[PDB]
Amino acid sequence: GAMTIVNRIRTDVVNVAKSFGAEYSEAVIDQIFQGFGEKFTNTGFAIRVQNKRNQKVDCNIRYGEAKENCLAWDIARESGLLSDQGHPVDTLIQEMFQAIPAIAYGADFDINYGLVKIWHLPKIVPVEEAFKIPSLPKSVNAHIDFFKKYHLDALCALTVDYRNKSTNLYFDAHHPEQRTTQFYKNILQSQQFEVPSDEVLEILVNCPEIAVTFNWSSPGIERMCFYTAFVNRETVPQHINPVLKKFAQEAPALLDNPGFLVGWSFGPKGTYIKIDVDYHGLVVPSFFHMHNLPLP
Numbered sequence: 001g002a003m004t005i006v007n008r009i010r011t012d013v014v015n016v017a018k019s020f021g022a023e024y025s026e027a028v029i030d031q032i033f034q035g036f037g038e039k040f041t042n043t044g045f046a047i048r049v050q051n052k053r054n055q056k057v058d059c060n061i062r063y064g065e066a067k068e069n070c071l072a073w074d075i076a077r078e079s080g081l082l083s084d085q086g087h088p089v090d091t092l093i094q095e096m097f098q099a100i101p102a103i104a105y106g107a108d109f110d111i112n113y114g115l116v117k118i119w120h121l122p123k124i125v126p127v128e129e130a131f132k133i134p135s136l137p138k139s140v141n142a143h144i145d146f147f148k149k150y151h152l153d154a155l156c157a158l159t160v161d162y163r164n165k166s167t168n169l170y171f172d173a174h175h176p177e178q179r180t181t182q183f184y185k186n187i188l189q190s191q192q193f194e195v196p197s198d199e200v201l202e203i204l205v206n207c208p209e210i211a212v213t214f215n216w217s218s219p220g221i222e223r224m225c226f227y228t229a230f231v232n233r234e235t236v237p238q239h240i241n242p243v244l245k246k247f248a249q250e251a252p253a254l255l256d257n258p259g260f261l262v263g264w265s266f267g268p269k270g271t272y273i274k275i276d277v278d279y280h281g282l283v284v285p286s287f288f289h290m291h292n293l294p295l296p
Ligand SMILES: [C-]#[N+]/C=C\c1c[nH]c2ccccc12
Pocket: 044, 045, 046, 062, 063, 064, 106, 227, 261, 276, 283, 287
């Protein structure tokens, strides 16, 4: 009935989790919302489901805003959501904000765990700017030639994953070679990752954003992910996977006509789909704008 926007969001988040069989902790949800509920109501907020092989669907909630400072860090620290682990991740987001000016930041939470990531969004810069950051995994610098080969020259975001102890570099996929299916075959084969069906490859050619995941325990790329946006429910490729169908059709949004972001993740494990509902309708236009693309 009548309720605050933040209570509407909470209810919708729990409803999604229940519908998809995702695990969640009431204590963790309350802890997240105490700190971040107001942000969720007023900024680009999204609810994500993802379907890792041979395990339950995970439900994540996330937001971003156009502020130059990493406001999530202070909030997560005071909320009890971000304790030091004695690890490179502890100072990494701080180092990112020192090394490269941000135009925005964000955060991501798994409702059965807590804070998973904090994001740094600069203006698009040369990838080499990242090599200033002291605690980046050594594997990142070692992949300089790989980045050049696959036209991963234009860094558009960075994230720290405190749970997984990993970091992602995100690239603006501007190059015309990235509009070809062969690019995606090649980049996946380069890491011995499985190549998806032709149908999926034909979707990937519209991807504006590529993520590459690195970690401190291994010299290689952990996984990579290709992001594609769809401006309404009906244009999500629902036929590809039952979770896409169900979430496109049923995901809650406060706006009556939301878009979606879908991430196609690949790894050696690492291979699955992520789908976010643009709950207030702010995320998908922002995504096109940050990639210098007209809105579809
Ligand atoms: C990762 N990635 C790319 C975009 C994205 C997906 N969900 C949300 C939510 C709020 C802002 C950006 C955003």
